[PDB]
């Protein structure tokens, strides 16, 4: 009869709704604090798995349907509790399913404040502090990349896929600025280059931006999943022999599956020779720039024309936090500006070059900076460094543990460059067969079955995927500071235990 | 002591940091609660304005610079307090600067939960509840638009600008699917049509997607800022006469400045006749679909092939909340899919049609659904309706108040269709008049001066802008349920006060 007789219409801005608003929000916070507590407790399941149809039918009875009339605030609080009950705990020490794992407390605080501030990034006028924080943070990132203060630009975007899109748009504007007014049909045939094992967002941007996927050329990778530079130069020559114009390459920089690093320095030499825009996709591998021990894997990045870097991956900033960094200033502005009305707006009393909105592809833009800035203040560069180092350390631990075991087979020959560890579990019946197309078809079914059993028990989660002619394999990854040695020991033992229950 | 010698490294996941984690977060919440309290208090300033260099060149105990070593949690709490101190209160009853104004308490709660859940929208695997909420909500939105309850399509996007971009991509794939593989050079000179007063995101997507801005054709508007269908038809004929290929029109649907509504039904007739994709940009005007009294302004929308609708504007959902709705299912999937790795994954144990990420242009995608879904549960459709109705009511009040005053001049002849009220403050010197390029040069300087004085005093904020040949004018807008009639009285009196100063 308290919250069960109260409605949202009775809260602020409703006259003198202050105390009840405070009490409601404190009741919400209480629910979230309990969830935060349980996230770091290993007795808690990673997830209570339900098929889509189970939750759609009233489970139980959590009602997802919408209606004409309001529910009570008590029912709203119940809906909050149930939503968290049936979701996946992405902060759990034993959640290894994605590249982004864990729950940073400072990041969480930063997020809660950002939501309270509730503003757009497009002008200094309504986001003065956040605009300056972005400027400070972006330049710091460019310094870490190895670029000089002489030049530099950048913006945060809604995901690294869109950061990658930015780089291609910027590269096309630098070389063929007439595309903006006249379109793709008014310039020569432009061709892009990316690794066979690079992220699909390159092809996606290729299609979206009017290049066509036929004109996104995949470069051959060696055994370790790295671009072979000789193939890159050969593809360039092949393109211009038929009258096409090579203008852009994407180097990764920490691939999504292998965690491989493309040889940036060799690629840069070829780019300098043929005048190609060099983009480095460090969405995943960019975290390693924070480590003195590991940053050498990105050597040559200082020669890139642009860099994609996702703090929301390795640095464990909360979703989303993705930057595109561009060496030369003015390219993003020139490429994207429409000088509308109305929003920018040259006769403001302040320097309108702080209205960053017109160099974006977005109009309205969510504030992603505060959570990241605050975390950097709370940790220091050394904080990120130590965190990244231990993640990579326990990835080495994992690799060494399974490296020479009969139960496991490594997908490729080579030490992992990132926290990615790619392996098959080999069931007893398959050990020493040997390798055959019939063996691969049976092996293919092993990973999805084990994953199904993982999700049913809710003990752990890890991703599986095929690649090229390889059958489904586990891609283990570590980015969660909550993950410990015993959590890795647990996972290994769990996969083995579940590999002995393939008969359901 | 307390937090003076505690650090982030001592909090969870650190072994014994549970008690200090809870206490820290409760101290953060306390700061946010005080800010929420003050947001709805009219004694509080909307903003304490500072030039960028003023904030950069040191504020007391507040360093923006980053360093190698951590600050104490006490200093972190101070940084939070200072950040909010020097920002703009977008929830303030007297904040009228943008189309998105106000602070919804349920929306705020929803946001806090979403951040705690911290997940991606791309698969049912890691976002089971949120994926279903999105499916339920999108179909409800399609029903409100007037489309079928079965099938249909849509997705939430990071802004209405990108929702607009989706619609052009979808139309292009529907009409010219060869572009995806061959590029734009395989189908020379495709053109897009949009109003002269439509949102710049159409031109922006035109440039980005390879059409060229030359091939984004602007349609003439009448006195009231509406597309002249006449005109629309004439430009189509002109375009195909020179060999170009029309395929797409954008109708708005609630324009950013005038708040005008394009005549969708007449445009739809022309689209049906010439086989053009009809997109309705209801980013701003879409909130009016929730009102039985006002939804008629969007009559014909049921005939659209796609609709952009931003709950984060009129419905007052916290940024960002934007949907693209597509009548025909499978277009977004066909247009956008890359069928990678990873993730998708076709051989999962659950129905993989519930993995929706491959029809997006994004890979990773922020959960924008919960805050919106929760607000809808908390308010009901009737809740949104009553809220929308009062905002439009006090926009009528404003219009009537200044309509026949010597101090004010209306930018165009006609009653506002939305909450947008466009007017000049005319100082004594320019009464009256006559209209000339010489006079417009003087009037242009008025609005920016008053705005500068507004921001200095921090009493209120309202936008100003030019359009075509018109000098800078004020564009008042109302979307904040906290705004009252007395706040409208205050703003008007404040404009007049600042007007001769």
Curated annotation (Swiss-Prot), chain B:
Enzyme class (EC, first level): lyase
Keywords: Decarboxylase, Disease variant, Epilepsy, Intellectual disability, Lyase, Neurotransmitter biosynthesis, Phosphoprotein, Pyridoxal phosphate
Positions contributing to 4-aminobutanoate binding: 98-100, 475
An annotated GO cellular component: clathrin-sculpted gamma-aminobutyric acid transport vesicle membrane
Cofactor(s) required, per the database record: pyridoxal 5'-phosphate
Highest taxon in the source lineage: Eukaryota
UniProt keyword annotation of Lyase present: yes
EC number: 4.1.1.15
A molecular-function term among this protein's GO annotations: glutamate decarboxylase activity
Reactions this protein catalyses: L-glutamate + H(+) = 4-aminobutanoate + CO2
Residues bearing the modification N6-(pyridoxal phosphate)lysine: 313
GO BP terms, alphabetized: chemical synaptic transmission; gamma-aminobutyrate shunt; gamma-aminobutyric acid biosynthetic process; glutamate catabolic process; locomotory exploration behavior; social behavior
UniProt KW Phosphoprotein keyword: yes
Protein family per UniProt: Belongs to the group II decarboxylase family.
Function: Catalyzes the synthesis of the inhibitory neurotransmitter gamma-aminobutyric acid (GABA) with pyridoxal 5'-phosphate as cofactor.
Subunit text: Homodimer.
Disease implication from the record: Developmental and epileptic encephalopathy 89: A form of epileptic encephalopathy, a heterogeneous group of early-onset epilepsies characterized by refractory seizures, neurodevelopmental impairment, and poor prognosis. Development is normal prior to seizure onset, after which cognitive and motor delays become apparent.
Name of the protein: Glutamate decarboxylase 1
The gene coding this protein: GAD1
């Amino acid at each position: 009869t308290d919250f069960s007789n109260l409605f949202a219409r009775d809260l602020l801005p409703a006259k003198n709704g202050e105390e009840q608003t405070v009490q409601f929000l404190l009741e919400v916070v209480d629910i979230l604090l309990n969830y935060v507590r349980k996230t770091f407790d290993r007795s808690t399941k990673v997830l209570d798995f339900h098929h889509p149809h189970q939750l759609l039918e009233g489970m139980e009875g959590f009602n997802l349907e919408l209606s004409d009339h309001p529910e009570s605030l008590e029912q709203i609080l119940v809906d909050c509790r149930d939503t968290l009950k049936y979701g996946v705990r992405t902060g759990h020490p034993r959640f290894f399913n994605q590249l982004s794992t864990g729950l940073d407390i400072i990041g969480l605080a930063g997020e809660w404040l950002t939501s309270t501030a509730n503003t757009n990034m497009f002008t200094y006028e309504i986001a003065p502090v956040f605009v300056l924080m972005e400027q400070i943070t972006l330049k710091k990132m460019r310094e870490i990349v190895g670029w000089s203060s002489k030049d530099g630009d950048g913006i945060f975007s809604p995901g690294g896929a869109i950061s990658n899109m930015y780089s291609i748009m910027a590269a096309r504007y630098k070389y063929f600025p007439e595309v903006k007014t006249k379109g793709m049909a008014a310039v020569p045939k432009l061709v892009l280059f990316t690794s066979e094992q690079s992220h699909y967002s390159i092809k996606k941007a290729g299609a979206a931006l009017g290049f066509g996927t036929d004109n996104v050329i995949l470069i051959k990778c060696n055994e370790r999943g790295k671009i072979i530079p000789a193939d890159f130069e050969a593809k360039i020559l092949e393109a211009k022999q038929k009258g096409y114009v090579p203008f852009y390459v994407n180097a990764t920089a920490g691939t999504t599956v292998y965690g491989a690093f493309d040889p940036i320095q060799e690629i840069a030499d070829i780019c300098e020779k043929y005048n190609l825009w060099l983009h480095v996709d460090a969405a995943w591998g960019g975290g390693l720039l924070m480590s003195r021990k590991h940053r050498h894997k990105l050597n040559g990045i200082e020669r890139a024309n642009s860099v994609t870097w996702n703090p929301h991956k390795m640095m464990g900033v909360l979703l989303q936090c993705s930057a595109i960094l561009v060496k030369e200033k003015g390219i993003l502005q020139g490429c994207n500006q429409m000088c509308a009305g109305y929003l920018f707006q040259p006769d403001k009393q302040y320097d309108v070059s702080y209205d960053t909105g017109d160099k974006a592809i977005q109009c309205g833009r969510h504030v992603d900076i505060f959570k990241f800035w605050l975390m950097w203040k709370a940790k220091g560069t050394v904080g990120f460094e130590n965190q990244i180092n231990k993640c990579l350390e326990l990835a080495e631990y994992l690799y060494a543990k399974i490296k020479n075991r009969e139960e496991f087979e490594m997908v490729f020959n080579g030490e992992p460059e990132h926290t990615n560890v790619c392996f098959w579990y080999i069931p007893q019946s398959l050990r020493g067969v040997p390798d055959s197309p019939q063996r691969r078809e049976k092996l293919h079914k092993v990973a999805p079955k084990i994953k199904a059993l993982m999700m049913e028990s809710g003990t752990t989660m890890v991703g599986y995927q095929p690649q090229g002619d390889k059958a489904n394999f586990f891609r283990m990854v570590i980015s969660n500071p909550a993950a410990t040695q015993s959590d890795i020991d647990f996972l290994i033992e769990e996969i083995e235990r579940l590999g002995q229950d393939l008969h359901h």
